Design a protein around this ligand. Structure first.
Ligand SMILES: Nc1ncnc2c1ncn2[C@@H]1O[C@H](COP(=O)(O)OP(=O)(O)O)[C@@H](O)[C@H]1O
Ligand SMILES: Nc1ncnc2c1ncn2[C@@H]1O[C@H](COP(=O)(O)OP(=O)(O)O)[C@@H](O)[C@H]1O
Ligand SMILES: Nc1ncnc2c1ncn2[C@@H]1O[C@H](COP(=O)(O)OP(=O)(O)O)[C@@H](O)[C@H]1O
Ligand code: NA
Ligand code: NA
Ligand code: NA
Ligand code: NA
Lengths: 488, 488, 488, 486
């Protein structure tokens, strides 16, 4: 068990004045990992006032001075990769084989990426006439808030804080109450790297209280939220009701994976496995509707069954463990309800479908990797995001049909196609209504690549150059050197 | 009085199925200009289905084919400028000297600007490694909705529809119920130019009903709103509770005009006049807080008095008329209540402060050009947007003070400084919290120049290259040519 | 017989003062099309003085004013497409089936493209610190010179003049002595569209005199040259010895077409035909080294021979004529010299290889469509650009080999691959050392697509947004608002 | 010790059998003997660079970024050591070399290191069945030819964008100042730069430079130097393989002092624009245009400033003026100074060599100011590249603009004025690529710099220079049926 975790405001840990606390559990064992202080409404005001003061210092530094500080944080993150991954595994239940290879690596990658782009953030100049011209500034928004999710805690904290800080802002970050521990470590790392006090403050708390106080605060200029659709709608309402904030949202999806008729089915099965069962299915971009040609459906089902048998649940710190428990018992209950709806609605259970039992599993919220086939577009498991290890296999006959069915959804996050054919790959992908599209692969999210959802799967984007710009606001300045003429 | 005006859906006028109608008044005479049908919830669904069909045709065309069609619309607008300006004057009360020289000219300027940029709308390509690369597409959002305000009806309709159409979308536009007529004329012009049926539909109606049905519709991907702060929060709230849509908002302001001690007071008075009394002060960007050095206040007040004396109210179609009535009689009542609040809080009335009377004025929603001086930051007339011909003059002593007071507001739309000093002009402008900044001028809004508000004055921008891109959504596509590795 | 053609300087035709003239021949008949005056040194000086005056007027106009004038020129070009194409056919010998569908259509496409981009030509702004910032202007170079080639006379004149004029420069254009007529017509069209006098001047003449005088003139800021390698070096030499001009060159190539082992051979044959025999083989981008897998070569040869037999030479104004004579009789002698070296070096003649004879051909500079096979990389017809209708078919065994051989050349203009395989298409293309690469096609050159040569095939690029910027020069301006500190 | 060539990550003996010497301009003594690269050495460097470039280009963008940033960290740590070597070779005071030469060199390397991941191509849809995408590909092997006034800074300003874009660079330093370029090559290797990616070939421009410009496998030349040498480079590159050339040449930059200017500010700007690095700077504002109504006051003010100049031991902290780069160069500066007298200019100060203990053995020229200067004097029309300020009087704004512009040079320019309109209005009409308002000499990594007209071709620094070390490849994917007309 760890020492009680405090708030991080203005370069130091500090006690909350709310008087309230909460606990974070190890989902593998059910044991209390740490007691955590919850930030109250006055704590948020203190953090904002800290952030405002830090932001002015940060923005007044040179671009390269900011770049050097963020790269020092990158170097610290590279050195502590394994220790941070272990803490992440304890807090989330994700296997160390994942956390040590993805979470901090790809979080630091994005921070490293934006650190180098700070000097390239430029405005524009526009000649109007000999006697007048316009120039623009890309100015910081000021103080922004990020609200994190629990499936990739430190990666989300880095993907939100890196462009915000690179753009000259201070960020107040509220991690998920399920997974607050790595965000506090990151705040320490930033200060050790030289980040001015107040530029990155962390306020653990519950969404109903700490999250709401951030969305309502009048001096916060932007909210960036990753999480479930329900928590997103409230954030948008209290953010609409309160001061007019720019909001960015990354929500879930029901992303289609389209297997072409010319595709190698070993590759298709491998992609489908990686698109559904990584992080035990708790990934917004997962390809949970797998469309397979009728002529290859039976063979593909066998290949999935063979691969599902290879999934190795067990000690989360063991090298060969590649499957973990779900993050909490309530989350598993929702996944189990979807599985039962699949059975009742006439889907064919190909494997899995039950909790795991026995020594090492009875204390965690384990669900067996689950695959449904003979699925139809009207089934609940096909239409709604489950956020668990549940693959739906759907049959199709022709390309126009599968494009129509892949797009027939309010979700819009990701999509993919498996095919060796040049024309088929680009032709199909160009017609899919999704922001993130993979050809003959799944899941890779380079720092250079803007990612985000179409339709109901999000607002705005993360990563890429455009996200650095989206954490600035444009000021247009006209210099009139001619004599001004009034008609009055 | 005109024949009952209908909805415009899919290239033709069509009767509303709501059974509801409303009226628009000539604010110069009190007469009913026309009865206008109101779009019901089923009419909105019809418009969306029409827009979905038209958008597919429009996006399938070549970039230059879309450019040629929009440039044809520009040519029609130039030819019909005078006819359109007269209808705008009848509907808004703005003098023909304004509508014939600004409203359509600058609206058509923006459409002409975007028509030429369509072929330069490009994605990106990013090499990851020899065996994989990413490319992006800037895809249409699909169907978007624009909600217009009443002060610049046809200019707003063009500033919203031009980037939306240039980016490959269809727009459903809801004009303000106070001024619905010119938007319906615009729809016929677009069709005459060759715009495919459905790409620009106009649905007159009320904000509470028609506006809400648009903000609620699940198949509209973006809302662009121009209006008051109050209605904007509802739009964002209703849009939040409903389908998760991209939002752009251009709201009001309380923009400061900072007269420096080295300013020519004749130039400063001319700028102050144009920033307050054009369009009878019904302009979101107006510089309604005029900061003048104490040492110059009395002389500046005299120069202002001279310019108010030159204002020529009268028949809106006369060439010499440069001041009109307010857009409606209810709006005049709101402006009068602000004027009474100024007297009751002790602001000194320098001129105006009453309705205009006599033949040709007693029937119009006229307010005299009004100037309050000896104004203080806590007064209601200084804190709240009036949207009428009411200038507030505030004394200041030093630069740091005027920057703090200029910035001490929830509004953030525009700002300006009058000074011949190089350092003072840029130094002040860089510290002001506003998106639109004029040095030694006011009011010019080139098509190339992004415009929009800080803080509560808006979300996003209009005009400039960035606004064309903001009407597309980014799709990132990874081509993996190497062997895919599954960990399962 | 046409009237004697004069120089076009400052908006009017004017007599040369050289005392020298030349004749242009109709290559289908041998007859003199027209006598054309040649510009001497004083004529070039006169053109520069005219250009300097006109450039100032042109650049002082608004961006949109320039845009509208160029679009008016586009409209005239569309209206006169057939008339201009017939003149081009008379001067060049290319079939009307080409000239009326390509030459002016794609020339006007580029002018239309750049006309719309003028308002998006923008500088940048870079904040250094609170007290200092930088902004940049993209200023016109001034007077630039274009030197055209004879194979696409009016297209080259448009591709060079469109970005130069759109960037605010004046251009002096020197057409090839072989094909001077359409350039003089283009000058008349620009004037009729409203181009200020002097902004586009045309000086027919010979390269050794008129061309050299332009490349040597101290007041020309940039040279753009399309032509053969030998003439380019002369241009580059005279430009270096003289005032320090920026040079751009589009020279020839020996571009490879790589047919993959999985390619459909009918598609491969159609692409190879279009890559070799359009415009009678007189195209810099032609795919004159056709690489075919050994196991498919015999079948590919059969398909080529069946298509070559469909080629229809004849009256250049007949709808079904798709093959024309070469541009001149001296050029035919060079092509015949290359054909004889192919025979003498042991390449196997598969078809053609001789002049065409009989009624209608005896007076034209006709060469039969010629195909060699069993070619090796050391043969002269494989190593050197012929600029005639001569295809070389080379066999290969594996992908690494064909890439090495495709790249083993000093030329670098174009390349292509025929394959339905996604990985193969991108993987091969990424390794080819050429600026213009076509997958499963040949020859399309969209206005948006930058085109130019690697290695010895060119310097710089044409088309695309980057070419508009390359006709401006950057001025960086630092505004220092802080106190300057001297160490002395 | 006999300095050698640097090829493929090690020092190697030249195969020319030729050598040259570099002199310490403060003492006249030989600093070092340096081997000169011959034609076989150039072919060696190119062949090594071709092999190294593929390894370098095959790495990830961030892998290249990290290596270049490691070089930055080494340069910072070795700033003082490198600065001292620069002082010995160039004669610039340590107060300059330790504060500018490596600092601003590393700044550009650091800047470009961060931009590598943002180097992107484009994608253009043509129709549903076809689209285009572009790659920004390395040119391959490029060559840089450096000047002697800022040896290591030029090496960094040329090599940083070239390497960041994925190329290998062969750098030929000036024979006057070859030493710091060889240290940089060592630093790059220590940082992990693949062997061959940065090769250094000291030599003479008549030989070594020509062999680079003539080599058929070099895709681009970037040259900084004098106009005459540049024209020879461009000729030899013309006669040879078709290379993209970039040139940063000299200038006769005008410094325009307005009627509302503070003359204390103007005099400080004029001092830094003329006498930094002993006036051997291409961007120096050697023509100082001053209003007649103020000339006398500005002159007094110039004499006051010139009096604080502290020549002396180049390693002393308070020294701010050094000798010229070579005694032969000193003669040319003195030849121009004598022409001002012969042409009638009034000598306000300087104009001779410096004498006495510590100066008789150095290549010192006194800080020189002429006034009563006219637009026709040689010293006003031609670049001297020494500590010689020319003061010129003017009467109206149009005159000073036309006179400022009445030159074939186009490198830099400046205006001193507190008035908003005058600064922008004047600067927008001046024909120069580098314009300073109320300052002089600052050259941020973000800011493109280069000459109008005869003062240069192309630009250095800024994002645009990273792109200019790439070449665009356009790729059309045609997914529709291809139609032949035959
Ligand atoms: N009303 C709210 N306002 C702000 N943040 C909230 C709100 N409700 C939840 N959150 C926060 O949003 C993030 C993601 O919540 P999520 O996991 O999607 O929902 P839930 O906890 O209801 O399953 C967490 O940080 C959570 O505390
Ligand atoms: N709740 C709403 N939802 C959508 N549109 C609305 C709403 N309220 C007002 N609008 C519309 O917004 C535009 C600007 O409204 P505004 O003048 O600020 O409010 P109102 O017209 O209600 O006084 C008009 O077209 C108006 O009808
Ligand atoms: N003809 C030439 N070809 C190539 N490089 C040359 C040539 N002449 C001089 N250089 C080189 O150009 C750089 C700058 O030369 P610069 O000082 O302008 O000329 P100079 O040699 O007359 O002093 C040095 O590296 C020099 O050796
Ligand atoms: Na936990
Ligand atoms: Na009305
Ligand atoms: Na001819
Ligand atoms: Na030396």
């Amino acid at each position: 068990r760890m020492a009680e975790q405090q708030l991080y405001i203005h370069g130091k840990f500090v006690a909350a004045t709310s008087g309230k606390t909460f606990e974070t559990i190890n989902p593998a064992t059910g044991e209390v990992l740490a007691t955590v202080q919850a930030a109250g409404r006055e704590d948020v005001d203190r953090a904002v006032k800290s952030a405002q003061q830090g932001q002015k210092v940060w923005a007044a530094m040179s671009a390269m001075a900011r770049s050097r500080i963020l790269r020092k944080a990158v170097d610290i993150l590279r050195e502590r990769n394994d220790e941070l991954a272990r803490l992440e595994t304890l807090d989330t239940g994700k296997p160390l084989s994942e956390t040590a290879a993805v979470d901090i690596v790809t979080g630091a990658d994005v921070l490293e990426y934006y650190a180098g782009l700070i000097p390239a953030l430029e405005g524009s100049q526009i000649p109007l006439r000999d006697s007048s011209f316009v120039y623009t500034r890309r100015e910081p928004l000021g103080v922004v808030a990020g609200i994190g999710a629990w499936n990739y805690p430190i990666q989300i904290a880095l993907w939100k804080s890196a462009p915000a800080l690179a753009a000259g802002n201070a960020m107040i970050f509220k991690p998920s109450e399920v997974t607050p521990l790595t965000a506090l470590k990151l705040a320490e790392i930033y200060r050790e790297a030289g980040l001015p006090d107040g530029v990155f403050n962390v306020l653990p708390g519950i969404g109903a209280e700490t999250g709401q106080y951030l969305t309502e605060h009048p001096d916060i200029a932007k909210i960036s939220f990753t999480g479930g659709v329900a928590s997103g709608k409230k954030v948008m309402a209290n953010s609409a009701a309160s001061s007019l904030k720019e909001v960015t949202m990354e929500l879930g999806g029901k992303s289609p994976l389209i297997i072409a008729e010319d595709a190698n089915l070993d590759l298709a099965a491998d992609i489908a496995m990686m698109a559904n069962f990584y992080s035990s299915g708790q990934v917004c971009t997962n390809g949970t509707r797998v469309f397979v040609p009728a002529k290859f459906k039976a063979e593909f089902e066998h290949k999935i069954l063979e691969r599902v048998g290879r999934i190795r649940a067990g000690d989360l710190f063991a090298d060969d463990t590649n499957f973990g428990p779900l993050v909490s018992f309530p989350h598993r209950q929702n996944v189990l309800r979807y599985i039962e709806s699949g059975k009742s609605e006439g889907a064919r259970l190909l494997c899995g479908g039950d909790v795991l039992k026995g020594e090492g599993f009875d204390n965690g919220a384990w669900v067996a990797p689950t695959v449904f086939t003979d699925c139809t577009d009207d089934m609940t498991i096909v239409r709604e995001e489950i956020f668990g290890p549940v693959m739906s296999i759907l049959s199709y006959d022709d390309e126009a049909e599968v494009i129509r069915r892949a797009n027939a959804t309010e979700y819009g996050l990701a999509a993919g196609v498996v095919t060796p054919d040049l024309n088929r790959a680009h032709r199909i992908i160009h017609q899919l209504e999704a922001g993130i599209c993979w050809i003959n692969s799944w899941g890779e999210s380079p720092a250079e690549m803007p990612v985000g959802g179409y339709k109901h799967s999000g607002i705005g984007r993360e990563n890429g150059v455009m996200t650095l710009q989206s954490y600035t606001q444009v000021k247009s300045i006209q210099v009139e050197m001619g004599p001004f003429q009034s008609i009055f």
